[PDB]
Amino acid sequence: DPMVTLSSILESIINDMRDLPNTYPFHTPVNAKVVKDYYKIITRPMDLQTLRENVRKRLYPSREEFREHLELIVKNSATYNGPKHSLTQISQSMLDLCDEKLKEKEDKLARLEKAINPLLDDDDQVAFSFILDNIVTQKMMAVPDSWPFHHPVNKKFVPDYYKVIVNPMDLETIRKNISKHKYQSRESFLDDVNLILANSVKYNGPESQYTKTAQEIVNVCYQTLTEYDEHLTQLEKDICTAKEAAL
């Protein structure tokens, strides 16, 4: 079972990162009753024990989902302690070691990932994701003053944001989903794109400049999809055929 082999590799990486100096503050969940403001600042807590339990629950079908959770450990420290705090440097040392090990094992990992999810090896899936990513970076992120939508809102800077927006979405998260080949057609991609606009309508109001910008992001997305419609339609058909064949 390739998911088991993959999981054993990921756990070994966790063992190696746990062994780096001064990493103990990251080995187990923050005690939110001692660090009493922690959840007022941090939205996505993560630690090496939770990461290991997620590996054991087989939640990670590839390098990328594992690494995204690992990176939260660094981002949370950067937000809570500060970008240059020793705790943030320590957590960065674990992400760096992870990246070394992932590089050393990349061919074995690619093979496991493809055995777990054959679409990661499908040339039509790959081409489709490449086009979506270029639409995001060259068209949607190029909309003037689109910076509020480039990354997740940091609750440190907008403290009530996630009390209002319980289904957040942003363009970086979409790019990560594209890199994971989450989208097999333009409809699921557009579900996420439109969630960005819906969240701005809900949080900022229909007439806010934030919402006008988000509306422009969605509109140039539709315009660019229309320009590539016939290629995208062929790719979506061939992906559906590949998806059905993996059965």
Ligand X SMILES: C[C@@H]1COCCN1c1nc(-c2ccnc3[nH]ccc23)cc(C2([S@](C)(=N)=O)CC2)n1
Q: Of 59-67, 73-81, 142-150, 221-229, which part binds ligand X (CB under 6 A)?
A: 142-150
- What is the enclosing helix (H) or strand (E) of 50? helix 48-56
CA distance 184 to 117: 13
> What is the closest distance, in whole angstroms, from the C-beta atom of residue 9 to ligand X in the complex?
32
Q: How far is the CB of 154 from ligand X (least distance, A)?
A: 3
Neighbours of 128 (CB within 10 A): 26
66 sits near ligand X (criterion: CB under 6 A): no
Convert residues 158-187 into a mask of x (bound to ligand X by CB under 6 A) and - (unbound): x-----------------------------
Cα–Cα distance list, 58 to 92, 139, 237 (Å): 25, 36, 30
Distance of closest approach, residue 37 Cβ to ligand X, in angstroms: 17
- Which C-beta is closer to ligand X: that of 43 or that of 224? 43
B/e letters for 203-214, b = 16+ CB within 10 Å, e = fewer, are bbeeeeebbebb
* Member of 184, 203, 218, 221 binding ligand X (CB under 6 A): 203
φ and ψ at residue 29, rounded to 5 degrees: -60, 145
Contact letters (x/-) for ligand X, 84-123, by CB under 6 A?
A: ----------------------------------------
Smallest distance from ligand X to CB 75, Å: 10
Considering only 148, 176, 182, 201, the residue that binds ligand X (CB under 6 A) is 148
Smallest distance, ligand X to C-beta of residue 148, A: 3
With contacts defined by CB under 6 A, how many residues of the chain interact with ligand X? 13
Looking at the Cβ atoms of 219 and 234, the one nearer to ligand X is 219
Q: Using CA atoms, how far apart are residues 105 and 7, in angstroms rounded to an integer?
A: 13
Residue 82, phi-psi category: left (phi > 0), alpha (psi -120 to 50), beta (remainder): left
Q: Name the segment binding ligand X (CB under 6 A); options: 8-16, 92-100, 144-152, 215-223.
A: 144-152
CA dist list (Å): 180 to 45, 61, 93, 174, 218: 22, 10, 24, 10, 22
Is residue 151 a contact point for ligand X (CB under 6 A)?
A: yes
CA 66 – CA 55 distance, rounded (Å): 8
Query: What are the residues binding ligand X (CB under 6 A)?
Result: 147-148, 150-154, 157-158, 200, 203-204, 210
